[PDB]
Write a protein that binds this DNA or RNA. Structure first.
Ligand SMILES: COc1cc(NC(=O)Cc2ccc(Br)cc2)ccc1C[C@H]1COC(=O)N1
Length: 1037
DNA sequence: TGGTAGGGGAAGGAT
DNA sequence: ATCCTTCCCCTAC
């Protein structure tokens, strides 16, 4: 009969816009080859491979790429008698769409589903694979969204006193819509129960009656909540139908192994006829939700496919050396490297190279690849850009990669390709996902996102930005840093030349793209982001896509929604806040005596658990808790100049406390199975426990997001206030109970074998949020760890309710208290520890980092300069503006002056002198507008360079003042109409031979030394700079 | 729709 | 000139 849902992906083409560079035409004179052919053409799109040629949209007998498609434009390319009986299947993503009966009356659906989507119904599509390998999609009918409104509040406000009345009023209100979107919608299209529930906020809140309204269309529900009865609090109206499917059917997950089973009236699932399909899948099914169950024994991934891809483009305008722009039809997409792996076997299966102008890849590349067990690359030759892109999208639709990865493909590759397919060549994308049409293929620019239905996009860029700490995230730098495999860099400045020389010098470009994509693939399967995120999704009841791109809040919200709905609440729709921690004012300096480091194990979550903090256990009014005994039944606490009451556990158990306790016991359970488990299983177990730790640390934050979903800043500020009180109490306890060594020996008969020469003292020296650093003069750092363990156990037992726990983690031999939240120390195990200083701050140049590192390394791993710090301590350090520095410090001078050498002596690496700085916002919204990386940004923009994406790190260097520098400064100032305007791209400032500001980098090295070593001189900065000048020849001051 | 503390460097105004 | 403010980077919990 034909398809029931029109396939919008291109399967036929007779005429297209042909654009291609004239540089590829050899029979043209070398003078008539500069421009770029652009114009309409009326020929069937074709692709060349290995001397043979075939139409792009030709599918069947002979193909150049692999194909996993069945339907292709109403053609059933499946061997007749293809009726694989499906029992179990894995699910990775879930689609939420709408289906109307009038539309589907063509398709031969069972009566049940047509009843489920009578006027309109919401259908939940599970996408995945069978164990055999078949692509599968099961359509779940019956899922209904629903939301609550207070009955006593609606009855009186809408002058109605019955649920059918509410149905009438909602239907009517939807009729007189702006655009008459819902014409003819009547009251019988809604279901309205009356049910008893309790708002989640405040303990005083008692149950009441709420209308529950069921809705079949996300559009209808959205419009209702947005402008129905704006004066009436609406509950759980944001809960989408997928979340209802997961929560209301207990046990289901958003990622894992399901099984079809008999249903309520001995109902079986029904397979769809191919002409009814709505996905690029091999078999599809219709079922109600009771036809589903979970399969338990299954634990391993199925044959999901991962496409890693990178692109490379060339300009075409008057300046072919500038950076391309997808909006200009002259700049074109020249090459696309595309490699497909199997995710269950982590094995590369195919390599493909789309190219404008045929080529042959270099032989060194081919030999390396063929020798590394990899497959034989297959090049695809195209005459136009449209044919190349159309073939790429046809590959995407036919092979149907369930996962897609690359590097910075969110801010460059996909937006370029889709801007080409959209603005220039006018191509619909809604079918080029998993759905045959009406799908999702958008790209967004507090985070950039890429959402493709049935296609999981994981940009390894973000993965590395979160997991690895670097100064710049160029793919080669990341490769050398993580795999220790350096590969060739590339720039657009070199691409046109390599293209013009011919097929071999363009095959070089192909080698570069394929090496990039191989590297990305290696990173991917080292970090396994798919398994990590899939485990998070399974934990939070949220589909993998929203797991990646839609933030954290949604996860905690979904689990809390599950628990509250289970326990009789309903979450109300809402759609520097509170005093944080106090850093213990440290008395600075170098400490050589043993230092002990205590800290709490998950302080904030344990506070929540112990004191039963929750939305439902909080109260702002005394009369609410005036009927129970203070202290024994509730906790009174003053937070932010206001009294708060938290009813204790035995009155009303906290929702947050339950979530935390269950998650924790779950984590402990799965971690107790790591030993007696195969490493294959142990990777999955570790990803699982990682996800659990993530959401557990996500609770408190979720509570503190003012104007977020379900915020309650009272809980957050109570948490912080309790933490501060706990630290203060720990300090005062250690001071008062163990001031006398008599007591130490008393509690622990182990300080006998630990009494040191000097006098005995024990005082808290440092503290931050959940940490205590205690000085132990008069004690030997022998087993200070193993005795501090019994100490912290004693403190926890004697001071804090469970599950609050204090542990002893590290004991320092020497430690440098620099300033607040900044310190360096040497652990008793010989390991160094650096926190807060410019050492760890990846915004400084590698030279000053290495220098300051050597300085501190000397300060800790050289006995003479350590004794010299002790001698600086012997005296008040105030007098030393006229006194001489002890001999031990000599070494410093040496290193310092070596610096000067490396600064001015050429043949040094300029990359060893680059600064970095992240571009936070869109630059138009800025208060100073006079920043280094902003200057570099605007200069890069004027120069038609690579405009940096909206949130990367920009590198830069500092120029010295010249006549050209000041002249161009005045000229740019007049065009717009010394301070650190001397900032330049390392690229431009190396090829133009620009010289660095030698004074600035030495003056900073002196500044970082001043900041790091002000501690040893009573923490005075001016004094430290002055007596630092005593390590530098005065001809440099 | 990820929280509060921090320190220190760059730039600019006020004392 | 000296400070004193404010913004901005990136840390530590
Ligand atoms: C690493 O330290 C901390 C990180 C955080 N992070 C966040 O709150 C970020 C966040 C995540 C998710 C959502 Br939704 C909202 C915000 C909070 C407190 C501490 C302090 C420590 C001390 O004791 C703790 O339990 N955490």
């Amino acid at each position: 009969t034909g398809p029931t849902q029109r396939h919008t992906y291109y399967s036929e083409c007779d005429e297209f816009r042909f654009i291609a560079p004239r540089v590829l035409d050899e029979d043209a004179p070398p003078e008539k080859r500069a421009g770029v052919h652009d114009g309409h053409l009326k020929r069937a799109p074709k692709v060349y491979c290995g001397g043979d040629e075939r139409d792009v949209l030709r599918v069947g007998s002979g193909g150049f790429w692999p194909r996993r498609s069945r339907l292709w434009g109403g053609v059933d390319h499946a061997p007749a008698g293809f009726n694989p009986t499906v029992t179990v299947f894995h699910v990775y993503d879930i689609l939420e769409n709408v289906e109307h009966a009038y539309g589907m009356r063509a398709a031969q659906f069972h009566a049940r589903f047509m009843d489920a989507i009578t006027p309109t119904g919401t259908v939940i599509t599970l996408l995945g694979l069978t164990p055999e390998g078949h692509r599968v999609a099961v359509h779940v009918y019956g899922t209904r969204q629903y939301f609550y409104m207070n009955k006593e509040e609606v009855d009186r406000h809408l002058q109605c006193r019955a649920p059918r009345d509410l149905c009438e009023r909602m239907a009517a209100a939807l009729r007189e819509s702006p655009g008459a979107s819902f014409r003819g919608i009547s009251a019988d299209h809604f279901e309205a129960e009356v049910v008893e529930r309790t708002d989640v906020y405040y303990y005083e809140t008692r149950p009441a009656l709420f209308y529950r309204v069921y809705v079949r269309s996300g559009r209808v529900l959205s419009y209702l909540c947005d402008n129905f009865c704006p004066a009436i609090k609406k509950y759980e109206g944001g809960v989408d139908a997928t979340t209802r499917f997961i929560l209301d059917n207990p046990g289901f997950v958003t990622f894992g192994w399901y099984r079809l089973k008999p249903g309520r009236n001995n109902t079986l699932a029904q397979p769809r006829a191919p002409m009814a399909f709505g996905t690029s899948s091999d078999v599809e099914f219709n079922c109600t939700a009771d036809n589903l169950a979970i399969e338990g024994g299954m634990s391993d991934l199925p044959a999901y496919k991962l496409m890693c891809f990178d692109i490379a483009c060339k300009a075409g305008g008057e300046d072919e050396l500038a950076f391309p722009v997808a909006g200009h039809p002259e700049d074109l997409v020249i090459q696309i490297s595309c490699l497909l792996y199997d995710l269950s076997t982590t094995a590369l299966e195919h390599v493909l190279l789309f190219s404008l102008g045929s080529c042959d890849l270099p032989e060194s590349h081919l030999n390396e690849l063929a020798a590394r067990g990899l497959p034989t690359p297959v090049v695809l030759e195209f005459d136009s850009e449209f044919e190349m892109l159309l073939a790429f999208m046809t590959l995407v639709k036919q092979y149907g990669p369930e996962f897609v990865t690359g590097y910075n493909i969110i801010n460059f590759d996909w937006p370029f390709l889709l801007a080409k397919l959209t603005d220039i060549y006018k191509v619909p994308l809604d079918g080029y996902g998993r759905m045959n049409g009406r799908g999702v293929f958008r790209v967004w620019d507090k985070r950039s996102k890429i959402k493709v239905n049935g296609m999981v996009n994981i940009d390894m860029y973000g993965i590395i930005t979160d997991k690895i700490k670097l100064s710049s995230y160029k793919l080669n730098a990341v490769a050398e840093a993580v795999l220790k495999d350096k590969k060739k860099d590339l720039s657009y400045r070199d691409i046109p030349a390599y293209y013009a020389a011919g097929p071999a010098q363009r095959g070089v470009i192909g080698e570069y793209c394929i090496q990039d994509s191989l590297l990305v693939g290696q990173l991917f399967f080292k970090f396994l982001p798919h398994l990590e995120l899939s485990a998070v999704a399974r934990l939070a009841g949220i589909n993998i896509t929203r797991t990646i791109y839609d933030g954290q809040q949604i996860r905690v919200f979904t689990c809390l929604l599950r628990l509250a709905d289970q326990k009789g609440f309903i979450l109300p729709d809402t759609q520097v806040g509170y005093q944080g921690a106090r850093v213990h004012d440290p008395t600075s300096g170098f400490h050589v005596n043993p230092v002990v480091g205590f800290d709490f194990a998950s302080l904030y979550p344990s506070i929540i658990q112990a004191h039963n903090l929750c939305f439902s256990t909080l109260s702002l009014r005394a009369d609410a808790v005036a009927h129970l005994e203070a202290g024994k039944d509730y906790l009174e606490i003053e937070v932010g100049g206001r009294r708060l009451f938290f009813v204790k556990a035995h009155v009303r158990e906290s929702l947050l406390s339950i979530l935390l306790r269950d998650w924790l016991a779950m984590r402990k359970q799965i971690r107790s199975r790591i030993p007696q488990s195969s490493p294959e299983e142990a990777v999955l177990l570790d990803k699982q426990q990682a996800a659990i730790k993530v959401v557990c640390n996500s609770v408190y934050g979720f509570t503190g997001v003012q104007h977020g979903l379900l915020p309650c800043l009272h809980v957050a500020a109570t948490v912080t206030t309790i933490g501060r009180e706990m630290l203060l109490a720990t300090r005062e306890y250690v001071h008062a109970r163990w001031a006398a060594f008599e007591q130490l020996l008393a509690d622990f008969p182990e300080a006998a074998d630990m009494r040191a020469p000097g006098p005995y003292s024990m005082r808290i020296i440092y503290g931050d949020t959940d940490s205590i650093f205690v000085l132990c003069r008069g004690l030997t750092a022998a087993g200070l760890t193993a005795m501090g363990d019994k100490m912290a156990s004693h403190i926890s037992r004697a001071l804090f309710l469970p599950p609050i726990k204090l542990e002893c983690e590290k004991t320092f031999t020497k430690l440098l208290l620099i300033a607040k939240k900044k310190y360096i120390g040497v652990i008793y195990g010989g390991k160094m520890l650096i926190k807060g200083v410019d050492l760890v701050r990846k915004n400084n140049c590698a030279f000053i980092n290495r220098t300051s590192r050597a300085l501190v390394d000397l300060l800790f791993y050289d006995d003479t300069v350590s004794g010299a710090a002790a001698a600086l301590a012997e005296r008040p350090a105030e007098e030393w503006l006229a006194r001489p520095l002890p001999e031990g410090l000599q070494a410093f001078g040496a290193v310092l002056v070596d610096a000067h050498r490396r600064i001015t002596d050429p043949e040094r690496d300029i990359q060893d002198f680059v600064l970095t700085a992240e571009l936070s916002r869109h630059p138009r919204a800025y208060t100073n507008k006079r920043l280094a990386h902003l200057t570099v940004y605007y200069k890069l923009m004027a120069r038609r360079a690579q405009v940096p994406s909206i949130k990367d790190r920009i590198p830069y260097v500092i120029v010295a003042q010249t006549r050209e520098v000041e002249e161009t400064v005045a000229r740019l100032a007049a065009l717009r109409e010394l301070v650190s305007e001397l900032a330049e791209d390392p690229a431009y400032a190396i090829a133009h031979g620009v010289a660095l500001n030698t004074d600035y980098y030495f003056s900073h090295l002196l500044g970082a030394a001043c900041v790091t070593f002000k501690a040893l001189f009573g923490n005075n900065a001016k004094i430290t700079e002055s007596l630092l000048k005593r390590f530098i020849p005065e001809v440099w001051h």
